[model samples]
Target chain A: ESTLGSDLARLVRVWRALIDHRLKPLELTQTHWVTLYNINRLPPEQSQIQLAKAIGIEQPSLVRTLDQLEEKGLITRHTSANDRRAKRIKLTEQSSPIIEQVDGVISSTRKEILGGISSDEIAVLSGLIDKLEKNIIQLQTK
Target chain B: STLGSDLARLVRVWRALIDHRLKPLELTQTHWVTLYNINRLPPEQSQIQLAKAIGIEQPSLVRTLDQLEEKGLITRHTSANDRRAKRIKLTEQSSPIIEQVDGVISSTRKEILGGISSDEIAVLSGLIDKLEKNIIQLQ
Candidate 1:
C-alpha cells in the first residue's frame, strides 16, 4: 500500500510554517503562542491543570511551557484559593494587545491556508477530519 | 471538533518540536527518517511513483531528498525498458544509518506517547491506520 503518511507529514509542515511565521512578530514560539491562545479562551484564573487540558498537552510538558510564559511576563501564575496543589493562570495586561494582534494574524493566515480550496470541498474535508479526530479520541478511550 | 483538524493541528505542533531537534542533525523531520526507510523497488519504478508510494509530493520530494543521489545512498537511472520510468534503489550505505538513528526517532516519538498507556497506543495506532485507509479509499 502507498504510504499516506507523507501527505499527512507535508500538511503538518505547511501548518507549522504558517503558524511559526505568524508568531514571529510576537516574539513567541509556536508552542508558547498555542499555550496562551487556549488559556485566553476561558474565564480568568484557570488552574494549571485546566490550561493543560485546554491545550491537550501532558501536565509536565505544560509546566515547562508555563515556565517560559512566566519568564516572558505573558501570563501571571498564582496559588489557587481552594487547592494548594493547583495553580491559577491569568494573562498579564501586556499580553492583551499581543493576543488581539495574534488573533488577527491567525484569522488572516487561516484564510490563506484555505485559499484556492473550494468552500464546499473544505467543508467536506473539515467534516472528514472532524470524524477522524473524534474517531481517534473514541478509540483512545475504548 | 473534527478529529481530522485537531489531529492535523496536533501533528503540526509535533513536527515543530521534531524539526527543532532534527535541525541540528542537519535534516528535516522527514529527511532524517525517510532516508533510511524509503523503499527502493526493483529497477522499474520512477521517482514520482516511489514518492507516490511514500505519500510525498513528487516535485517537492525531488530537491528535498536529492541527497539520495549525491550521497550514493540511492540511484536513479532512465529505464531502457521504459523511457518514462526511472529505476530506483537503495545502497549498502543506507541500512547502517537507519539502524543507528532509528532509535533516536523512536525515543522522540515515545515522548509524545508518554503518559498515555500501551493499550492507548494500540488503540490510537489502530484508529490512525483506519483513517489512513479511509482516506486512501477516497483517492
Candidate 2:
C-alpha cells in the first residue's frame, strides 16, 4: 500500500528533471550535469570506469556522456576517450566558470530540499542508498 | 552517487511534475497520493495507517485530510474507540476523481519512463521499496 518502490522511482526521475531545468542554460540534461559534477570533483587519476561507479550509472551511458562533455570542450581525456589506455577526465579552462555556477545552483537546491530533514537522518539515508546501490549491482551479477 | 544533493533536486521535481499535472484536477501530490492509496486500501482506513501508506508524515496527512474533507472527497468519523480515534472513508464524490487522477498520474509516469521496459522499472522499483522501508524503520 505504501507504493514505496514507485515512490523511489518517482524520486530519482523527478530529481533528474529538477537539475535538467536549473541547468537549462547549458542545454544539457540531468545526466550531463551529473557527469560533469562528478568528473569535475573526482580525482584526476581516477579512470572512466571508476568515474561511472561514483556517478551510480552504467558505463556505456557514462561513455556517451563523456563524448558530449569532450565535444563541448568542457573536458578532455588522457588520450582518446574510447581507447583502452585512456584514463582520467580533465576539466578545461572553459569549465571553471560553469562549475562555479553549477555548484551554487546545486548548493541552494540542496539547502532547500534538505531544509526540513536533519543531518542525522540524511547520513542514515545516504547509508541506505549506498547499500541499495550495492544490492542493485550485486543483483546484476546474478 | 550524488544522492545527497541530487536527491533533493529529484524529489522537488517529481513533486512539481505531479503537482503540475494534477493542478487541473485541483489535486497535488499530497492529495493524489492519499487518494490513490485510499482507493487501493480497504474501506474505513485509519488516518495513521493511511499516512504511512502514503509515505508521508502525519502532519502532512492531517492537512491533506482536511482538504479532502473540505472538497467532499472524504469524511472522517470517530471510530468510537477506547482512545477515541478517527477513520478515513471515501465519499460518493471520490471515485470518479480518483479514477481521473490515477489516469493522469499513470500517463505522466508513462511519458517519463518512455523507451524503458517494464522489467527494468520492476527491478528499480523493488530496490526503491527497500530504501523507503528502511526510512520508515528508522522512524
Candidate 3:
C-alpha cells in the first residue's frame, strides 16, 4: 500500500492541472494568480517575505514570481516602512481589472470542477483535505 | 481520479526542494540520490532499466550521472561482454549515508498523513498501488 498522504497529493495535482487549464488563457500561473488575488483582497502594501508566507512558497521562488509580475506591470515593489531588509509589494492600477476578470474565471471553474461530486461529498473531501494539511503542519512542528 | 500524474509532479517539486537542500553538501539532486543509489546496486542495470522503472529519462540521466562519475562518486565503463552497454557502479563511501537519507525521506513522507487512521492509509495505499500498476501495465 502507498500512503494516504500520497493520494491526497495526487488529488491536489489533478486539481492544480485543472485550474492551470482554466488560467492558461489569462496567461497567469496558479502561483501568479493566487499572489495577485491575495494582494487585491488586502490592498495595503506589504513585504514580499510576508506575501510568500501567505502563499506558501519558498522565498527564492517568491522572488522569481515577484520579478515576473513586476515585469508584467501587474505588481510593484518598493521599500517597506517597517523593514528596510524587505521590499513592499502592491498590485498596480493595470492589475485591478485583470484580477476581477480572473476572479470570475476562478469562481466559475471551481463550480465546474466540483460538478460531478455532490455537496456532501465535497464537504467530506474538503474536511479530509484540511485534516491532511493540518497533519503535515503538525508534523512540521515536531 | 487517478492520482499518478499529480503524484509525479509533486514528487518533482519535493525533489526540487530536496535538491536545493542538498546543494551545500556538493551534490546535485539526482547525482547524490538516484544515481548514487543505483550505482550501489549489483552491476546489471542499464540506462533504460532506471529510465522505465525509476521514472527518470535515460539520455538526460546519462549526462547528469556522467558528472558524478567525473567527480569520483561512481564509475561508468562500457561492458566488455556487451559493447553497446555501459555498466554503472557505485563506490563504498556513499552507500551508508544514501541509505540514511532515503530513510529520512520515507519517514518524513509517512508522517504527512499521520492524522489518518492506519486502516484508511491501507485503503488509500491499495488504491494508489493498483493505479500505479495499471499505469505501468498499459504502457
- Candidate 3 on B1-139: residue-level lDDT in tens? 3122224334545444445445556665556556534744566866776654434568877786778667665677889999988777766765765665555556666655566766555544554454344333321
Go through the candidates in order and give each one's DockQ. 0.09, 0.07, 0.14
Residue by residue across A1-142, what tens digits does model 3's lDDT show? 3334334444444455655666777887788886776666554555556666556577898889889999999988887787777665778888888898767665655555555444544454445445654554444454
Selected candidate, larger lDDT, 1 vs 2: 2
Task: State the iRMSD of every prediction, in order shown.
Answer: 9.7, 10.7, 7.0
Estimate TM-scores for all models: 0.53, 0.48, 0.58
Interface C-alpha root-mean-square deviation of candidate 2: 10.7
lDDT of 2 by residue, B3-111 (tens): 6544443444444566676777876667787888887787566767777667667888888889889999988877776357776778987889988877766665555
Report the lDDT of model 2 for residue A5.
35
- Score residue B82 of candidate 2 by CA lDDT: 38
| Best-performing candidate as measured by TM-score | 3
Fraction of real interface contacts that model 3 preserves: 0.09
Report the C-alpha displacement of residue B30, candidate 1, in angstroms.
9.0
The per-prediction tally of clashing pairs is 5, 3, 1
Q: Rank all candidate structures by their DockQ, best first, as comma-separated numbers.
A: 3, 1, 2
User: Candidate 2 — which residues are off by over 4 angstroms?
Assistant: A80-84, A134-142, B5-139
- Which CAPRI level is candidate 3? incorrect
What does DockQ come to for candidate 1?
Answer: 0.09
